[PDB]
Amino acid sequence: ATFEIVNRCSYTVWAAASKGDAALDAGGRQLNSGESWTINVEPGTNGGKIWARTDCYFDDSGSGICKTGDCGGLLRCKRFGRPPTTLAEFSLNQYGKDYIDISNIKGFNVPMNFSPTTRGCRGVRCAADIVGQCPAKLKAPGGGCNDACTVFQTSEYCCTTGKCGPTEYSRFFKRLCPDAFSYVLDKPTTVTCPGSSNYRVTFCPTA
Numbered sequence: 459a460t461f462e463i464v465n466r467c468s469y470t471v472w473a474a475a476s477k478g479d480a481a482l483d484a485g486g487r488q489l490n491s492g493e494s495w496t497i498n499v500e501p502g503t504n505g506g507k508i509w510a511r512t513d514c515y516f517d518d519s520g521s522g523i524c525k526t527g528d529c530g531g532l533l534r535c536k537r538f539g540r541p542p543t544t545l546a547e548f549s550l551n552q553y554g555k556d557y558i559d560i561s562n563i564k565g566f567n568v569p570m571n572f573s574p575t576t577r578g579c580r581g582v583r584c585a586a587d588i589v590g591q592c593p594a595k596l597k598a599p600g601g602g603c604n605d606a607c608t609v610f611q612t613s614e615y616c617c618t619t620g621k622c623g624p625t626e627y628s629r630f631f632k633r634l635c636p637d638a639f640s641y642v643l644d645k646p647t648t649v650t651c652p653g654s655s656n657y658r659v660t661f662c663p664t665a
Contacts, residue, residue: 471661478537506547520534521533542608562632574656
């Protein structure tokens with residue numbers, strides 16, 4: 459599958475692509491404002507994630523730091539990024555279907571459109587100003603809006619027992635982005651695509 463990753467933000471992001479135990483394609487790259495990065499994701503990729511990182515410093519070997527979505531200080535992510543991270547999530551060729559979603563379960567740093575570039579299902583979008591509106595106790599100092607599970611580390615927010623409900627914090631994310639996961643047991647906003655669909659992830663799709 460091809461993912462085109464486009465930075466429509468006015469600021470530089472460092473795209474990341476990981477399935478949690480491995481990079482997808484190169485796993486990470488600097489995107490200046492307007493730059494496009496095409497990756498190939500293996501068919502059958504289960505639990506793929508794409509995210510943006512903000513305010514990165516990388517030295518010559520690709521080691522450094524980001525204020526949001528840092529993945530063990532690497533330019534080329536092998537692991538998931540540190541919250542807050544708006545997540546493009548995908549499982550490809552799962553019994554002849556692709557499953558895509560956006561999640562705020564790991565919070566929100568960068569607005570995001572996640573759309574197929576092939577036919578047969580709709581894209582999803584979380585492009586509201588969640589950082590600007592972010593409740594005071596979820597505000598990440600480095601930028602972005604933490605989920606309540608990252609901040610408070612409770613069973614209710616992290617859904618540790620596999621039982622929990624929506625919360626004041628989950629409902630803030632859900633109110634601003636109905637089409638994204640707000641908490642672990644949120645009514646699914648998963649979109650079903652045809653197997654071997656191609657995708658565009660756009661950072662700042664409206665800004």
